[PDB]
Swiss-Prot record, chain A:
Organism: Mus musculus (Mouse)
Lineage: Eukaryota, Metazoa, Chordata, Craniata, Vertebrata
Name listed for the protein in its UniProt record: V-type proton ATPase subunit D
GO function term, MF aspect, one: proton-transporting ATPase activity, rotational mechanism
Subunit architecture: V-ATPase is a heteromultimeric enzyme made up of two complexes: the ATP-hydrolytic V1 complex and the proton translocation V0 complex. The V1 complex consists of three catalytic AB heterodimers that form a heterohexamer, three peripheral stalks each consisting of EG heterodimers, one central rotor including subunits D and F, and the regulatory subunits C and H. The proton translocation complex V0 consists of the proton transport subunit a, a ring of proteolipid subunits c9c'', rotary subunit d, subunits e and f, and the accessory subunits ATP6AP1/Ac45 and ATP6AP2/PRR. Interacts with SNX10.
GO BP terms: cilium assembly; protein localization to cilium; synaptic vesicle lumen acidification
Swiss-Prot record, chain B:
Keyword Transport among record annotations: yes
Protein name: V-type proton ATPase subunit F
SUPFAM superfamilies listed in its UniProt record: AtpF-like
Gene Ontology MF terms in the entry: proton-transporting ATPase activity, rotational mechanism
Membrane-related topology note: Peripheral membrane protein
Subunit comment: V-ATPase is a heteromultimeric enzyme made up of two complexes: the ATP-hydrolytic V1 complex and the proton translocation V0 complex. The V1 complex consists of three catalytic AB heterodimers that form a heterohexamer, three peripheral stalks each consisting of EG heterodimers, one central rotor including subunits D and F, and the regulatory subunits C and H. The proton translocation complex V0 consists of the proton transport subunit a, a ring of proteolipid subunits c9c'', rotary subunit d, subunits e and f, and the accessory subunits ATP6AP1/Ac45 and ATP6AP2/PRR.
Stated family: Belongs to the V-ATPase F subunit family.
Annotated function: Subunit of the V1 complex of vacuolar(H+)-ATPase (V-ATPase), a multisubunit enzyme composed of a peripheral complex (V1) that hydrolyzes ATP and a membrane integral complex (V0) that translocates protons. V-ATPase is responsible for acidifying and maintaining the pH of intracellular compartments and in some cell types, is targeted to the plasma membrane, where it is responsible for acidifying the extracellular environment.
Keyword RNA-binding: no
UniProtKB/Swiss-Prot annotation, chain C:
Quaternary structure annotation from Swiss-Prot or TrEMBL: V-ATPase is a heteromultimeric enzyme made up of two complexes: the ATP-hydrolytic V1 complex and the proton translocation V0 complex. The V1 complex consists of three catalytic AB heterodimers that form a heterohexamer, three peripheral stalks each consisting of EG heterodimers, one central rotor including subunits D and F, and the regulatory subunits C and H. The proton translocation complex V0 consists of the proton transport subunit a, a ring of proteolipid subunits c9c'', rotary subunit d, subunits e and f, and the accessory subunits ATP6AP1/Ac45 and ATP6AP2/PRR.
Source domain of life: Eukaryota
Physiological role: Catalytic subunit of the V1 complex of vacuolar(H+)-ATPase (V-ATPase), a multisubunit enzyme composed of a peripheral complex (V1) that hydrolyzes ATP and a membrane integral complex (V0) that translocates protons. V-ATPase is responsible for acidifying and maintaining the pH of intracellular compartments and in some cell types, is targeted to the plasma membrane, where it is responsible for acidifying the extracellular environment.
Signal sequence annotation: none
Protein's name in the database: V-type proton ATPase catalytic subunit A
Family per record: Belongs to the ATPase alpha/beta chains family.
Subcellular location per the Swiss-Prot or TrEMBL entry: Cytoplasm; Cytoplasm, Cytosol; Cytoplasmic vesicle, Secretory vesicle; Cytoplasmic vesicle, Clathrin-coated vesicle membrane
From Swiss-Prot, chain E:
Family: Belongs to the ATPase alpha/beta chains family.
Chief localization: cytoplasm
Subcellular location as annotated: Cytoplasm; Cytoplasm, Cytosol; Cytoplasmic vesicle, Secretory vesicle; Cytoplasmic vesicle, Clathrin-coated vesicle membrane
Primary role: Catalytic subunit of the V1 complex of vacuolar(H+)-ATPase (V-ATPase), a multisubunit enzyme composed of a peripheral complex (V1) that hydrolyzes ATP and a membrane integral complex (V0) that translocates protons. V-ATPase is responsible for acidifying and maintaining the pH of intracellular compartments and in some cell types, is targeted to the plasma membrane, where it is responsible for acidifying the extracellular environment.
Protein name according to UniProt: V-type proton ATPase catalytic subunit A
Organism: Mus musculus
Subunit structure and binding partners: V-ATPase is a heteromultimeric enzyme made up of two complexes: the ATP-hydrolytic V1 complex and the proton translocation V0 complex. The V1 complex consists of three catalytic AB heterodimers that form a heterohexamer, three peripheral stalks each consisting of EG heterodimers, one central rotor including subunits D and F, and the regulatory subunits C and H. The proton translocation complex V0 consists of the proton transport subunit a, a ring of proteolipid subunits c9c'', rotary subunit d, subunits e and f, and the accessory subunits ATP6AP1/Ac45 and ATP6AP2/PRR.
Length: 208, 110, 203, 193, 200
């Protein structure tokens, strides 16, 4: 196992040398790919918290407007939970090839179905439309954050795969090949030496 | 265009989001949400989360932080990208930053 | 010289003898003291001997073949295990790897300088291999029959179920040819086999 | 000999002759006589035949340079590929097609007893055009390789079966008309994408 | 030949010589005029000269060992920085590679084309080494980092002026400067740092 089983010859030297050069080029490329993927990972990390804080303040404002609407119309919660048939917003799953990996990503699609206007309870529609905006902005930002989330997890798994490959080529393949190469060199030198000895012997005998 | 946002939360969140139109009844007349209160149980939450998992038209989950605390093991065990689970905290209580499923993945961070 | 097999002396001897017992330095480095590289070794007296086993130890014949195949399959996986880690293989594969590992650690290993292992009568070896292969096929069939069920038996479950039984199977090698009758050790092997049967059926 | 590239005989011959052809590292396909090694294969009559060819054929110069480029291209990539980009794919299968059909003459068969100039011209021209009509970008010009394969499987079989046009039996006009018809087939297939 | 260290000559020489001063063209690309790759160099006469340095330069002996330790430390620190980045570092780490930067820029690099930096008389070197290590020793067992701590940005905003003087120590010319003058000046810098930790 410690050496690739090949009989020593000059052809063996050339082929092993080519394979060695190839191993270094492949290693170097995979290292570079890993660097780029790490950069994209860190870039995601840099914005997750900013999105989270904007999230927090927006949701706080929106659920405040909900509290005010509850003061206005009283108990519209019961009727709105009562009225659930169709939604006006869906999510579109599209792809991003930031690198050789495929990245899941989402988009905030608006179907456009009619919303359930509520006006019976003391005519609270003035608060209700305010809510329709406050929560809608939040929903948009959610869809964005979720896109970021799925991208993050898939990116993590891919980068770990590439790191596995880099370690595999770095700590296993190269030492085996170079050990083989050294062994071939040694065998060839020994053979040439034996030839030299035989020729010198016959030459010395030629004197008689 | 493909899938359906789903939300589990107290009355405040579910009301506010159904105002935003997040909500659907399938052909079997089954909601994509669960109103949860003191009367709702943890095992029912976990079962309904798995019911969402069974559906092929979800994509996104919106969990109130109390609910996330209640079924932490189910959420953590489900290391799947298909539900892009997002944590969100409740009205009257502080923001939930610790125990975030992704912040643990990062190490060089706060 | 050099530890390889390129010198003309060795190559010359290979062309004459019929049986070849290669040794590998790393194995003796492991303190796997009887360091025999089964992979490279071979024997050309397999024929003209089957009659002896058919007349005395007929069951040995399939058994050794099975063991050889298991060793080869372990080797055939080991490279891809080494290149890429675990958690990418089916239950059968890891089961075969682990049983082959225990074969390596117990059956192949033999310390002839302890008083109790200076010599191993053949029937002891036959019984040991019989117990091993019986356990192997029983485990493999058990996990296979539950492949499409709602509860797939994994290797961790088998360990939790039979750690102590595996320990006894490992300590199986502690049978002194003297100071311990042939009958009692044979009965011990049979009793261990019955225990393995009971533990499997209970699962 | 066993020392394909180091024996003094090949060395001495290499230092004298003007045009040399060699085989590559011995492939597993031992019957693969038409191999070519770019490392030591060369010809020094490229200049002297320019003035002859300028009044017979001038199209083959860019085609030959492209053939050399694409052969070099998979020669460079196959190393990493053993250890992807759409252009990499297009180029790789194009080069394999060239190696299998433009090269790999049996020699002994009714279909390789002799290949006149026009047959080579048609073969390589159609191959390189097929390469060019896909290599340009993801789109038809500035999808994936699999959709190209599933659409044009029949066309690819025709590309491979180009070699079965016997010159001894089939007249030259029929064979070149067939090449042109199949060129139009490729054009129609690519434009429908 | 081509850097091959398996050449029988290279092995034979490396087995007999005691001191090896490696050189690197990469260092020369940075314009490091004394291009000496310390990470590969070594000296086996350390014990041979310990008696002379005990007799004459008692204080020198501990200093160099700490310096070598700092070099190994900043190597490791650079590794972990390459893994993530300098943000994740603690304050002790920040101080250590900052001292590594300053030693590399002043005590390590040389410019033999200036009258003030073309000959080390070995007592100026002792002084600047002692001052460097005294600063490094201030970083330990004298700050809150060794409850709330003090980040090095605060220490910089406090005494960047004395950091700059420590850096500019290099510009002392022995021919024009009395030996006593330079020792007194470096003592002045030391007691300036003394007032510096006294104030903070």
């Amino acid at each position: 196992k410690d050496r690739i089983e090949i009989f020593p010859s000059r052809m063996a030297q050339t082929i092993m040398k080519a394979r060695l050069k190839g191993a270094q080029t492949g290693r170097n490329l995979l290292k570079k790919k890993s660097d780029a993927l790490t950069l994209r990972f860190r870039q995601i990390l840099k914005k997750i918290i900013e999105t989270k804080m904007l999230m927090g303040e927006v949701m706080r404002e929106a659920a405040f407007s909900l509290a005010e609407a509850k003061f206005t119309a009283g108990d519209f919660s019961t009727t709105v939970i009562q009225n659930v048939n169709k939604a006006q917003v869906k999510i579109r799953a599209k792809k991003d090839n930031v690198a050789g990996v495929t990245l899941p990503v989402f988009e905030h699609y608006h179907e456009g179905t009619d919303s359930y206007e509520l006006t019976g309870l003391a005519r609270g529609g003035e608060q209700l439309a305010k809510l329709k905006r406050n929560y809608a902005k939040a929903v948009e930002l959610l869809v964005e954050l979720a896109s970021l989330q799925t991208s993050f997890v898939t990116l993590d798994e891919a980068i770990k795969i590439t790191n596995r490959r880099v370690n595999a080529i770095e700590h296993v393949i190269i030492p085996r090949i170079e050990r083989t190469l050294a062994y071939i060199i040694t065998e060839l030198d020994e053979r040439e030496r034996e030839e030299f000895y035989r020729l010198k012997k016959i030459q010395e005998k030629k004197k008689i | 265009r493909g899938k359906l946002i789903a939300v589990i939360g107290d009355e405040d969140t579910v009301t506010g989001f159904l105002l935003g139109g997040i909500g659907e009844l399938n052909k079997n007349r089954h909601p994509n949400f669960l109103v949860v209160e003191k009367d709702t149980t943890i095992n029912e939450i976990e079962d309904t989360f798995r019911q969402f998992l069974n559906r092929d038209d979800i994509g996104i989950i919106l969990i109130n932080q109390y609910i996330a605390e209640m079924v932490r093991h189910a959420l953590d065990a489900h290391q799947r990208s298909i539900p892009a689970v997002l944590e969100i905290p409740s009205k009257e209580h502080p923001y939930d930053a610790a125990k975030d499923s992704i912040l643990r993945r990062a190490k060089g961070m706060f | 010289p050099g530890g390889d097999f390129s010198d003309p002396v060795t190559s010359a001897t290979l062309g004459i003898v019929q049986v070849f017992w290669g040794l590998d330095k790393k194995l003796a480095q492991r303190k796997h003291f009887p360091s025999v590289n089964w992979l490279i070794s071979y024997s050309k007296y397999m024929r003209a001997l089957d009659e002896y086993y058919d007349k005395h130890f007929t069951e040995f014949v399939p058994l050794r073949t099975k063991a050889k195949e298991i060793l080869q399959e372990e080797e055939d996986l080991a490279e891809i295990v080494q290149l890429v880690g675990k958690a990418s293989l089916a239950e059968t594969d890891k089961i075969t790897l682990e049983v082959a590992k225990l074969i390596k650690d117990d059956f192949l290993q033999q310390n002839g300088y302890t008083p109790y292992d200076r010599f191993c009568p053949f029937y002891k070896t036959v019984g040991m291999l019989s117990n091993m292969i019986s356990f192997y096929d029983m485990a493999r069939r058990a996990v296979e029959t539950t492949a499409q069920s709602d509860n797939k038996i994994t290797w961790s479950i088998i360990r939790e179920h039979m750690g102590e039984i595996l320990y006894k199977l490992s300590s199986m090698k502690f049978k002194d040819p003297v100071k311990d009758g042939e009958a009692k050790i044979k009965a011990d092997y049979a009793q261990l086999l019955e225990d393995m049967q009971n533990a499997f059926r209970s699962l």
